[PDB]
PDB file of C-alpha atoms in Angstrom:
ATOM      1  CA  UNK R   1     -25.167  -4.345  -3.030  1.00 40.10           C
ATOM      2  CA  UNK R   2     -21.928  -4.001  -1.066  1.00 41.31           C
ATOM      3  CA  UNK R   3     -19.831  -0.881  -1.513  1.00 42.91           C
ATOM      4  CA  UNK R   4     -17.359  -1.618  -4.344  1.00 41.01           C
ATOM      5  CA  UNK R   5     -13.716  -2.266  -3.499  1.00 42.54           C
ATOM      6  CA  UNK R   6     -12.784   0.840  -5.520  1.00 43.68           C
ATOM      7  CA  UNK R   7     -14.798   3.117  -3.168  1.00 43.92           C
ATOM      8  CA  UNK R   8     -12.950   3.994   0.037  1.00 47.17           C
ATOM      9  CA  UNK R   9     -13.964   6.238   2.922  1.00 44.75           C
ATOM     10  CA  UNK R  10     -11.971   7.758   5.757  1.00 39.94           C
ATOM     11  CA  UNK R  11     -12.055   5.378   8.705  1.00 40.58           C
ATOM     12  CA  UNK R  12     -12.209   2.268   6.521  1.00 39.45           C
ATOM     13  CA  UNK R  13      -9.973  -0.608   7.609  1.00 39.35           C
ATOM     14  CA  UNK R  14      -7.690  -1.887   4.835  1.00 39.58           C
ATOM     15  CA  UNK R  15      -6.169  -5.371   5.061  1.00 44.03           C
ATOM     16  CA  UNK R  16      -3.540  -6.165   2.432  1.00 44.01           C
ATOM     17  CA  UNK R  17      -1.506  -9.250   1.567  1.00 43.82           C
ATOM     18  CA  UNK R  18       1.854  -9.010  -0.229  1.00 40.26           C
ATOM     19  CA  UNK R  19       2.819 -12.510  -1.409  1.00 40.67           C
ATOM     20  CA  UNK R  20       6.485 -12.961  -2.333  1.00 43.39           C
ATOM     21  CA  UNK R  21       7.263  -9.375  -1.383  1.00 40.99           C
ATOM     22  CA  UNK R  22      10.625  -7.864  -2.322  1.00 40.58           C
ATOM     23  CA  UNK R  23      12.695  -5.141  -0.670  1.00 40.32           C
ATOM     24  CA  UNK R  24      13.326  -1.873  -2.523  1.00 38.12           C
ATOM     25  CA  UNK R  25      15.954   0.437  -1.038  1.00 37.89           C
ATOM     26  CA  UNK R  26      14.390   3.569  -2.577  1.00 39.26           C
ATOM     27  CA  UNK R  27      10.675   4.023  -3.292  1.00 39.00           C
ATOM     28  CA  UNK R  28      10.323   7.025  -5.590  1.00 41.02           C
ATOM     29  CA  UNK R  29       6.917   8.093  -4.254  1.00 41.24           C
ATOM     30  CA  UNK R  30       7.983   7.713  -0.590  1.00 43.64           C
ATOM     31  CA  UNK R  31      10.828  10.233  -0.622  1.00 43.05           C
ATOM     32  CA  UNK R  32      13.259   7.578  -1.926  1.00 47.13           C
ATOM     33  CA  UNK R  33      12.876   5.707   1.374  1.00 46.81           C
ATOM     34  CA  UNK R  34      12.692   1.890   1.451  1.00 47.38           C
ATOM     35  CA  UNK R  35       9.603  -0.219   0.879  1.00 46.46           C
ATOM     36  CA  UNK R  36       8.399  -3.792   0.595  1.00 44.73           C
ATOM     37  CA  UNK R  37       6.423  -4.456  -2.577  1.00 44.11           C
ATOM     38  CA  UNK R  38       4.492  -7.273  -4.237  1.00 39.17           C
ATOM     39  CA  UNK R  39       3.037  -7.807  -7.700  1.00 41.28           C
ATOM     40  CA  UNK R  40       0.461 -10.355  -6.456  1.00 41.22           C
ATOM     41  CA  UNK R  41      -1.080  -8.229  -3.711  1.00 41.34           C
ATOM     42  CA  UNK R  42      -4.689  -8.361  -2.551  1.00 41.63           C
ATOM     43  CA  UNK R  43      -6.613  -5.555  -0.859  1.00 42.18           C
ATOM     44  CA  UNK R  44      -9.544  -6.060   1.526  1.00 42.93           C
ATOM     45  CA  UNK R  45     -12.039  -3.586   2.960  1.00 43.03           C
ATOM     46  CA  UNK R  46     -12.526  -5.336   6.287  1.00 41.66           C
ATOM     47  CA  UNK R  47     -15.838  -3.777   7.345  1.00 45.03           C
ATOM     48  CA  UNK R  48     -17.519  -4.146   3.939  1.00 44.77           C
ATOM     49  CA  UNK R  49     -15.908  -7.540   3.301  1.00 44.94           C
ATOM     50  CA  UNK R  50     -15.148  -6.687  -0.331  1.00 45.59           C
ATOM     51  CA  UNK R  51     -11.767  -7.646  -1.760  1.00 48.18           C
ATOM     52  CA  UNK R  52      -9.859  -7.838  -5.025  1.00 46.68           C
ATOM     53  CA  UNK R  53      -6.432  -8.425  -6.476  1.00 47.35           C
ATOM     54  CA  UNK R  54      -4.556  -5.122  -6.618  1.00 45.54           C
ATOM     55  CA  UNK R  55      -3.674  -5.853 -10.257  1.00 47.06           C
ATOM     56  CA  UNK R  56      -7.385  -6.243 -11.102  1.00 46.62           C
ATOM     57  CA  UNK R  57      -8.286  -2.704  -9.986  1.00 45.23           C
ATOM     58  CA  UNK R  58      -8.308   0.279 -12.347  1.00 41.96           C
ATOM     59  CA  UNK R  59      -6.515   2.632  -9.997  1.00 39.55           C
ATOM     60  CA  UNK R  60      -7.489   5.839 -11.805  1.00 42.68           C
ATOM     61  CA  UNK R  61     -11.113   4.944 -10.959  1.00 41.56           C
ATOM     62  CA  UNK R  62     -10.529   4.419  -7.218  1.00 39.46           C
ATOM     63  CA  UNK R  63     -11.936   7.130  -4.963  1.00 40.42           C
ATOM     64  CA  UNK R  64     -11.505   8.216  -1.355  1.00 39.36           C
ATOM     65  CA  UNK R  65     -14.544  10.088  -0.009  1.00 41.03           C
ATOM     66  CA  UNK R  66     -15.696  10.470  -3.609  1.00 40.62           C
ATOM     67  CA  UNK R  67     -12.419  12.029  -4.794  1.00 38.90           C
ATOM     68  CA  UNK R  68      -9.869  10.496  -7.144  1.00 42.14           C
ATOM     69  CA  UNK R  69      -6.673   9.345  -5.469  1.00 45.22           C
ATOM     70  CA  UNK R  70      -3.655  11.621  -5.517  1.00 43.17           C
ATOM     71  CA  UNK R  71      -1.170  10.394  -8.121  1.00 44.64           C
ATOM     72  CA  UNK R  72       2.461  11.145  -8.963  1.00 43.83           C
ATOM     73  CA  UNK R  73       4.803  10.271 -11.820  1.00 43.49           C
ATOM     74  CA  UNK R  74       8.399   9.386 -10.939  1.00 44.90           C
ATOM     75  CA  UNK R  75      10.980   8.388 -13.563  1.00 42.36           C
ATOM     76  CA  UNK R  76       8.091   7.965 -15.997  1.00 39.98           C
ATOM     77  CA  UNK R  77       6.002   5.615 -13.812  1.00 39.42           C
ATOM     78  CA  UNK R  78       2.693   6.555 -12.160  1.00 37.85           C
ATOM     79  CA  UNK R  79       1.905   5.870  -8.488  1.00 39.30           C
ATOM     80  CA  UNK R  80      -1.455   6.175  -6.712  1.00 35.40           C
ATOM     81  CA  UNK R  81      -1.760   7.115  -3.033  1.00 35.13           C
ATOM     82  CA  UNK R  82      -4.194   5.669  -0.493  1.00 36.39           C
ATOM     83  CA  UNK R  83      -3.461   7.737   2.633  1.00 34.42           C
ATOM     84  CA  UNK R  84      -3.780   6.314   6.132  1.00 36.54           C
ATOM     85  CA  UNK R  85      -4.485   7.707   9.570  1.00 36.62           C
ATOM     86  CA  UNK R  86      -1.653   6.461  11.728  1.00 34.93           C
ATOM     87  CA  UNK R  87       1.026   4.120  10.447  1.00 34.20           C
ATOM     88  CA  UNK R  88       0.983   1.032   8.256  1.00 34.02           C
ATOM     89  CA  UNK R  89       1.362  -2.115  10.365  1.00 34.42           C
ATOM     90  CA  UNK R  90       2.872  -5.163   8.682  1.00 31.77           C
ATOM     91  CA  UNK R  91       4.364  -8.522   9.603  1.00 29.71           C
ATOM     92  CA  UNK R  92       5.556 -11.760   8.052  1.00 28.88           C
ATOM     93  CA  UNK R  93       2.483 -13.772   7.092  1.00 27.41           C
ATOM     94  CA  UNK R  94       1.521 -16.430   9.619  1.00 25.06           C
ATOM     95  CA  UNK R  95       4.119 -15.241  12.151  1.00 28.38           C
ATOM     96  CA  UNK R  96       4.494 -12.739  14.973  1.00 28.01           C
ATOM     97  CA  UNK R  97       7.628 -11.282  13.332  1.00 25.50           C
ATOM     98  CA  UNK R  98       6.610  -7.649  12.898  1.00 27.56           C
ATOM     99  CA  UNK R  99       7.976  -5.109  10.476  1.00 27.07           C
ATOM    100  CA  UNK R 100       8.378  -1.405  11.089  1.00 28.63           C
ATOM    101  CA  UNK R 101       8.207   1.625   8.821  1.00 26.41           C
ATOM    102  CA  UNK R 102      10.834   4.152   7.786  1.00 26.87           C
ATOM    103  CA  UNK R 103       9.311   6.818  10.068  1.00 28.98           C
ATOM    104  CA  UNK R 104       9.254   4.340  12.927  1.00 26.33           C
ATOM    105  CA  UNK R 105       9.620   6.962  15.690  1.00 29.28           C
ATOM    106  CA  UNK R 106       7.817   9.994  14.245  1.00 28.59           C
ATOM    107  CA  UNK R 107       4.211  11.177  14.354  1.00 27.65           C
ATOM    108  CA  UNK R 108       3.942  10.923  10.559  1.00 26.48           C
ATOM    109  CA  UNK R 109       1.069   8.957   9.067  1.00 26.13           C
ATOM    110  CA  UNK R 110       1.752   6.444   6.297  1.00 26.99           C
ATOM    111  CA  UNK R 111       0.175   5.786   2.905  1.00 23.34           C
ATOM    112  CA  UNK R 112      -0.309   2.782   0.681  1.00 23.44           C
ATOM    113  CA  UNK R 113       1.172   3.390  -2.765  1.00 23.76           C
ATOM    114  CA  UNK R 114       0.276   1.468  -5.926  1.00 27.59           C
ATOM    115  CA  UNK R 115       2.139   1.510  -9.223  1.00 29.31           C
ATOM    116  CA  UNK R 116      -0.268   0.920 -12.108  1.00 29.37           C
ATOM    117  CA  UNK R 117       0.680   0.804 -15.796  1.00 27.11           C
ATOM    118  CA  UNK R 118      -2.928   1.307 -16.895  1.00 21.76           C
ATOM    119  CA  UNK R 119      -3.411  -2.367 -17.747  1.00 19.73           C
ATOM    120  CA  UNK R 120      -3.627  -5.463 -15.539  1.00 19.04           C
ATOM    121  CA  UNK R 121      -0.309  -5.168 -13.677  1.00 19.62           C
ATOM    122  CA  UNK R 122       0.076  -3.335 -10.377  1.00 21.81           C
ATOM    123  CA  UNK R 123       2.572  -3.246  -7.494  1.00 22.46           C
ATOM    124  CA  UNK R 124       1.609  -2.520  -3.871  1.00 21.68           C
ATOM    125  CA  UNK R 125       4.207  -0.750  -1.700  1.00 19.90           C
ATOM    126  CA  UNK R 126       4.466  -0.427   2.087  1.00 19.43           C
ATOM    127  CA  UNK R 127       7.070   1.678   3.879  1.00 20.04           C
ATOM    128  CA  UNK R 128       9.868  -0.164   5.674  1.00 20.70           C
ATOM    129  CA  UNK R 129      13.005   1.043   7.418  1.00 18.00           C
ATOM    130  CA  UNK R 130      15.236  -1.867   6.359  1.00 19.30           C
ATOM    131  CA  UNK R 131      15.240  -5.613   5.619  1.00 20.06           C
ATOM    132  CA  UNK R 132      13.928  -6.665   9.041  1.00 18.57           C
ATOM    133  CA  UNK R 133      11.783  -9.301   7.281  1.00 18.84           C
ATOM    134  CA  UNK R 134      14.549 -10.207   4.826  1.00 16.83           C
ATOM    135  CA  UNK R 135      15.379  -9.004   1.340  1.00 15.91           C
ATOM    136  CA  UNK R 136      12.635 -11.152  -0.190  1.00 12.54           C
ATOM    137  CA  UNK R 137      10.783 -13.080  -1.288  1.00 13.18           C
ATOM    138  CA  UNK R 138       8.744 -12.947   1.923  1.00  9.78           C
ATOM    139  CA  UNK R 139       4.983 -13.186   2.395  1.00 11.86           C
ATOM    140  CA  UNK R 140       3.828 -10.021   4.173  1.00 10.95           C
ATOM    141  CA  UNK R 141       0.459  -9.031   5.632  1.00  5.13           C
ATOM    142  CA  UNK R 142      -0.442  -5.400   6.264  1.00  8.36           C
ATOM    143  CA  UNK R 143      -3.135  -3.494   8.122  1.00  8.35           C
ATOM    144  CA  UNK R 144      -4.120   0.164   8.235  1.00 10.65           C
ATOM    145  CA  UNK R 145      -6.925   2.671   8.648  1.00 11.54           C
ATOM    146  CA  UNK R 146      -7.759   4.800   5.608  1.00 13.52           C
ATOM    147  CA  UNK R 147      -7.075   8.465   6.287  1.00 14.30           C
ATOM    148  CA  UNK R 148      -8.352  11.792   4.978  1.00 15.38           C
ATOM    149  CA  UNK R 149      -7.859  13.264   1.538  1.00 15.61           C
ATOM    150  CA  UNK R 150      -4.453  14.981   1.267  1.00 14.20           C
ATOM    151  CA  UNK R 151      -4.364  18.774   0.988  1.00 16.57           C
TER     152      UNK R 151
END
């Protein structure tokens, strides 16, 4: 059977869709820097072909290289980190209008962050510098390579 969507490995390719994404000026888990986020996001492991709604995944069971994801609580809410190698690339769905991240001209690598209440609701966040794709709602597609476990 195919590797489950909850099992990630370094070097995996992650394709994400953020339907009706909204702009947040300050993402608590991203150093209070801006982010686009969606509550109807889907996540795809491109090489394995497996996929699921982000809100369908139990994020405290997701692993990267067999290790639980790093998690942080900010203002009482829990966020889970899927680190990348390189940056997160995103654009307006169906267009060539690209977004860019907060650290758009640094050598910093990005991370996907997921808020999960422990039930069947979850928000996917991607770093953005500003409202270059609008304040929302805007359909956004994202693409990254899963990175190593954070020290």
